[PDB]
């Protein structure tokens, strides 16, 4: 139940797992949010930012009791026609003051930079379509773009597509292709021999 | 209660056509005198203490309260349940099979509903399951302790122990100097031991097996399956194809609504009762005999204002259901415990909701009828609330 | 552009009384959540009356029915109201006094006199019709006044909140208004104003009395002024009749009024809304 | 001074339950002359129930009790007020809230506890510690005290503008779209403000709430009535936050620390307060906001 009992018990799970023949790093936050919390950090407050696929998760933890202090507006968009509705109700002033929903893409104006979310999305509903937003997404005048999807190789540890990494990186090589793009990878959550649950790419444009 | 989430609730309320909700029932005031948790007698009193001239006998059944919709039509009737739901999930065909024994009771020219309070019948039509996991579960437990209790040595070597000299020793310079010393018996090595046993707790095995085979036959009878039927028991009112209803606030429908089942009708007014008294009981213990889980006591016209629409009675062989195999031994304790009131508090108002709904005509019900919508949410807040009571009456 | 901006709701509840307005009401105010009831009959019973009293008190109690009304859908708040009136309009103004700031919406509750008394007649009776309005605005042009273009052209002046800060002082004993203050940015009008082809114009509510220690807080500031109009002494009645009365005396039609500088509502109401004229108007003043 | 000058009253009655402070006031009202009484607990009876609710609820009711008591004393109308309050938060609030309207007064409601619960309740006694002393308190205005910010006055004499309803009025025009904003007419007072003021050596500084996709419309606009502007300031496309959070962006992100602004020109109340009241800014307000 807490982050100090947890640092006590981690290095015996880890080093019974060194046994079993397996380098383990665990960890108390969840992969959710163990993610959310990458995100958050790697943007940064300092751009707005544009929310791909979204229940509204991402939306109150980049208000957080205004400790982070969120200049800009909030822009989000959504298929899910559920989404929109919730989108809708928050727009009878349960706050969402700046935020900004759509739905077509030739509704998003705004002309000015942005960090884009691809929170999970580009496989969790929609296959090689993701070839499509990602490819629109980078056209947009953004600063940073980060992606998320499953590992697959991780399906050994549990109990719509998925790909592997290279299957992601070739995925990701093939829709920057020769921009002058700048493209960091890597892992979110417990890592076990290499890897992690959710695969990570951080795209900055040079 | 969450706003967003008991709109949705009242809405269905209203589409379904429902026309009235339901009464919680208190059991009968206690005697502490009679020993009887739930005393016929003191439950009988009452009510001539504030006004009741007659008073009528209905048997208590084992099933799920049920409000019967019967239309003419007897294909599109429906069932809602004890609080605001209707129930379907049940072979809607099996039901109305089970329906026209009631529906042939009646003569519906010019009358095109009848809504009519029952007991679906048997309790596990809707309550098995609730029958596997929990009583079953508790028999079963205690069943196999009981068997291990008389199979194993175990008993027998405490009670060898309890003799020795060495114990007893323990037991008396111990009942007399306070957690002392230390008590220079071997630390705690011995303090701990023979503290142990004697603070075990022994059982009178044959009477606990007894015991637990009368929860066992109990269970045996009310919680096996299964071919639904009702027990009709009042016609809460009557609505005429004309436009006009007839609320008809009597419990003694009954013996036209189905129920040829034995009932009674007394007119104990103003302590002629006492004498009157002893016919009552002696009928009641027939229907205890008789396998059955009590008996009810209503006013005889259904509603009176300020007023309880009922007590139950619910005999100690059933009470052992509701509380351990042992009732019957720790009789005195939980008389204790027990205050009939609270739930008598909700129980006028529940019924005394239920009257103000069916008060409103049928041709009414809907969304667009917000007296019906007050009158449920504060009958829904009464649920919120009489939940949170002794869970147990 | 698609943006769309979302105003509160005001929702009028028209009905003759037995309806059922009320009991709609309170199963919506407990079901739904950001909303407040104004009922005009609660507020009579504030002032304990049974029902209908001098049209003193219906008066008052109207602008406090208003206030309530119009504090709330400013703070954002969705507001419901029992009207007991629904009379062949008294719906209109309860329509042009608000359409200003929400999305107002009706429920007619309508029901037969011979059910109605489950407890006469009430006219329905009109071409009104319920259509949901949005919100409104309008004041969409300045009816500035067809003034003489050829007068000098000139500005005109407040001192007290406008030019001269008190500072603390007591505004009534304006004997010490030479240790007053100066606000920098209305003085720097006047300086730009002069320099220009403007008649720079003061106008004040200090009584005559005290105009040695006013030219002498003009002088050390060194505020350059043509004309120095002021309240007779012992005059002592509306701050804004008085400036009226100077302006349609003094300098209407005989300068040409390019602007006014003040700070007291009172009176720069009387500027705008009698007088016609631009005034810009530094600074609060709510007294 | 010498002279007579009158104010409404303001009556605040200061007591416990039962201490008969209702019961004076239905008296009183009835036999002064021009009085109206506030209940907050009347008041959330509108709102049906009894006398504690919400805080959301409890705080709307504050909305309205003071709109109306200002509404009334701004009409001269005297009010009593009856304050199941009584606390010291609550009284020198209160005090703070209305002197400047009214001429406060006080009548305090003492009773013996004993008596006290014989109005028939929860036996609760209350914060009476005869604290503050009651007297009557004159109104006072506080504020011609008028402190600017410390702007660098080595920067250039700059003014600001508004564009809609100050600098350019909308004849109809709809608000949120500026494209139809070459047809716009000018208040010539204000137009002639920013003439004068580029003559002296003032840079003048448009700044619009308008979506910047309506920049051309506008341009035309100005050069139409020969408006010699230095920048122009526009809100982002696409941004549609409230007027104050986008102009104040633009406010210290761009004129900010390199012009000295000398004063600005406004319509809507709501900018205003935000130049006014966070930046500690003189600006004057052209016509009436309240949008
Ligand atoms: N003759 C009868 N008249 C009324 N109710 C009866 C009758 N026979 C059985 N019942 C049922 O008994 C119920 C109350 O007794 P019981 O203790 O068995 O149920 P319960 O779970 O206590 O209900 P609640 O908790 O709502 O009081 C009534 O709601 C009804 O379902
Ligand atoms: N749909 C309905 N069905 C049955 N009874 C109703 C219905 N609506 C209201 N009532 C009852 O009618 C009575 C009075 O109606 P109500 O209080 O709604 O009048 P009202 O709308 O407040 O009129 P006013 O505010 O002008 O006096 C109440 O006792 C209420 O319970
Ligand atoms: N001098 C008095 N002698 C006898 N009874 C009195 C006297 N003054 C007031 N009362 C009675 O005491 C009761 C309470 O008085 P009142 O209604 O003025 O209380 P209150 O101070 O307004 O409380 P609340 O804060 O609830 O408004 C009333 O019924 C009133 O008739
Ligand atoms: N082409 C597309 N355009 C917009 N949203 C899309 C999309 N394809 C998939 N999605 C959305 O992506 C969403 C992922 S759910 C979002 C995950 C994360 N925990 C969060 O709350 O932010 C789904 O709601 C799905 O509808
Ligand atoms: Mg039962
Ligand atoms: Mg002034
Ligand atoms: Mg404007």
Redesign the pocket.
Same mark, same amino acid.
């Given at each position: 139940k807490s982050e100090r009992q947890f640092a006590e018990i981690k290095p015996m799970f880890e080093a019974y797992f060194k046994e079993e023949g397996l380098d383990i790093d665990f960890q108390f936050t969840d992969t959710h949010g163990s993610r959310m919390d990458f995100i958050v950090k790697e943007l940064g407050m300092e751009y707005p930012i544009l929310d791909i696929g979204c229940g509204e998760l991402k939306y109150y933890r980049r208000f957080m009791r205004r400790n982070y202090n969120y200049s800009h507006p909030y822009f989000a968009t959504d298929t899910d026609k559920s989404v929109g509705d919730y989108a809708a109700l928050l727009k009878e002033r349960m706050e969402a003051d700046n935020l900004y929903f759509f739905s077509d893409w030739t509704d998003y104006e705004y002309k000015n930079p942005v960090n884009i979310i691809l929170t999970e999305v580009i496989e969790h509903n929609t296959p090689e379509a993701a070839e499509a937003l990602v490819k629109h997404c980078l056209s947009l005048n953004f600063h940073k773009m980060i992606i998320t999807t499953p590992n697959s190789l991780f399906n050994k540890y549990y109990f719509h597509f998925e790909w592997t990494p290279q299957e992601f990186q070739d995925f990701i090589r093939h829709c920057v292709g020769d921009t002058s793009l700048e493209v960091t990878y890597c892992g979110i959550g417990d890592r076990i021999n290499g890897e992690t649950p959710t695969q990570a790419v951080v795209i900055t444009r040079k | 209660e969450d706003k967003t989430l008991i709109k949705k609730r009242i809405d269905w309320f209203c589409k379904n056509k429902i026309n009235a909700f339901?009464?919680?029932?208190?059991?009968a005031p206690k005697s502490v005198e009679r020993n009887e948790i739930e005393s016929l007698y003191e439950g009988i009193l009452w009510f001539v203490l504030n006004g009741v001239k007659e008073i009528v006998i209905? #048997?208590?059944?084992?099933?799920?309260?049920?409000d019967i919709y019967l239309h003419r039509r007897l294909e599109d009737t429906y069932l809602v349940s004890?609080n605001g739901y209707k129930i379907n999930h049940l072979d809607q065909e099996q039901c109305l099979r089970a329906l026209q024994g009631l529906h042939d009771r009646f003569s519906w020219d010019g009358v095109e509903l009848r809504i009519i309070?029952s %007991?679906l019948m048997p309790w596990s039509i809707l309550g098995k399951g609730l029958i596997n996991n929990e009583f079953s579960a508790y028999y079963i437990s205690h069943e196999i302790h009981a068997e291990y209790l008389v199979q194993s040595s175990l008993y027998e070597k405490l009670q060898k122990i309890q003799q020795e000299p060495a114990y007893l020793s323990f037991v008396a310079d111990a009942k007399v100097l306070s957690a002392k010393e230390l008590k220079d018996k071997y630390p705690m090595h011995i303090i701990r031991q023979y503290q142990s046993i004697r603070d075990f707790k022994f059982l009178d095995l044959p009477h606990y097996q007894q015991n637990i085979q009368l929860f066992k036959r109990q269970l045996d009878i009310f919680g096996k399956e299964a071919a639904p039927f009702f #027990?009709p &028991?009042?016609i809460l009112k009557e609505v005429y194809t004309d436009g006009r209803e007839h609320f008809v606030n009597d419990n003694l429908s &009954?013996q036209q609504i189905n129920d040829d089942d034995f009932l009674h009708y007394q007119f104990t007014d103003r302590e002629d009762f006492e004498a009157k008294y002893p016919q009552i009981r002696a009928w009641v213990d027939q229907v205890n005999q008789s396998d059955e889980?009590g008996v009810?006591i #209503?006013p005889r016209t259904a509603f009176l204002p300020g007023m309880p629409?009922?007590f #139950?009675v619910?005999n100690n062989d059933y009470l052992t259901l509701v509380y351990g195999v042992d009732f019957e031994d720790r009789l005195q304790e939980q008389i204790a415990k027990r205050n009939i009131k609270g739930?008598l508090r909700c129980?006028i108002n529940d019924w005394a909701i239920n009257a103000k709904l069916l008060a409103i005509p049928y041709s009414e019900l809907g969304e667009e009828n917000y007296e019906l919508k007050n009158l449920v949410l504060d009958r829904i807040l009464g649920e919120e609330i %009489?939940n949170q009571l002794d869970?147990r009456? | 552009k698609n943006n769309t901006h979302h105003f509160p709701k005001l929702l009028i509840l028209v009905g003759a009384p037995g309806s059922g307005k009320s009991t709609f009401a309170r199963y919506f105010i407990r079901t739904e959540d950001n909303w407040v009831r104004v009922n005009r009959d609660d507020f009579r019973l504030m002032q304990f009356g049974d029902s209908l009293m001098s049209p003193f008190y219906e008066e008052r109690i109207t602008k406090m029915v208003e206030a309530s009304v119009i504090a709330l859908l400013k703070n954002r708040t969705n507001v419901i109201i029992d009207a007991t009136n629904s009379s062949l309009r008294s719906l209109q103004d309860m329509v042009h006094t608000y359409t200003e700031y929400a999305d107002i919406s009706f429920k007619v509750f309508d029901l037969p006199v011979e059910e109605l008394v489950k407890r006469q007649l009430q006219y329905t009776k009109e071409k009104f019709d319920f259509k949901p309005i949005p919100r409104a605005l309008k004041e969409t042009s300045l009816t500035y006044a067809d003034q003489d273009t050829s007068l000098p052209k000139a500005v005109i002046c407040d001192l007290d909140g406008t030019l001269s800060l008190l500072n603390g002082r007591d505004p009534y004993n304006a004997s010490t208004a030479d240790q007053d203050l100066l606000n920098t940015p209305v003085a720097m009008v006047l300086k730009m104003a002069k320099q220009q082809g403007y008649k720079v114009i003061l106008l004040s509510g200090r009584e005559n009395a005290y105009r040695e220690p006013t030219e002498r807080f003009l002088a050390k500031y060194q505020i350059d002024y043509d004309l120095l109009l002021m309240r007779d002494t012992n005059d002592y009645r509306k701050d804004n009749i008085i400036k009226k009365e100077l302006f349609l005396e003094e300098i209407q039609g005989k300068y040409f009024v390019e602007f006014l500088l003040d700070d007291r509502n009172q009176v720069v109401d009387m500027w705008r809304r009698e007088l016609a004229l631009p005034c810009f108007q530094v600074n609060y003043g709510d007294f």
């Open positions: - | 339901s009464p919680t029932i208190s059991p209905e #048997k208590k059944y084992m099933g799920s309260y049920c004890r309070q %007991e #027990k &028991f009042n &009954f889980e009810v #209503k629409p009922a #139950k619910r739930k129980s %009489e869970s009456l | -």
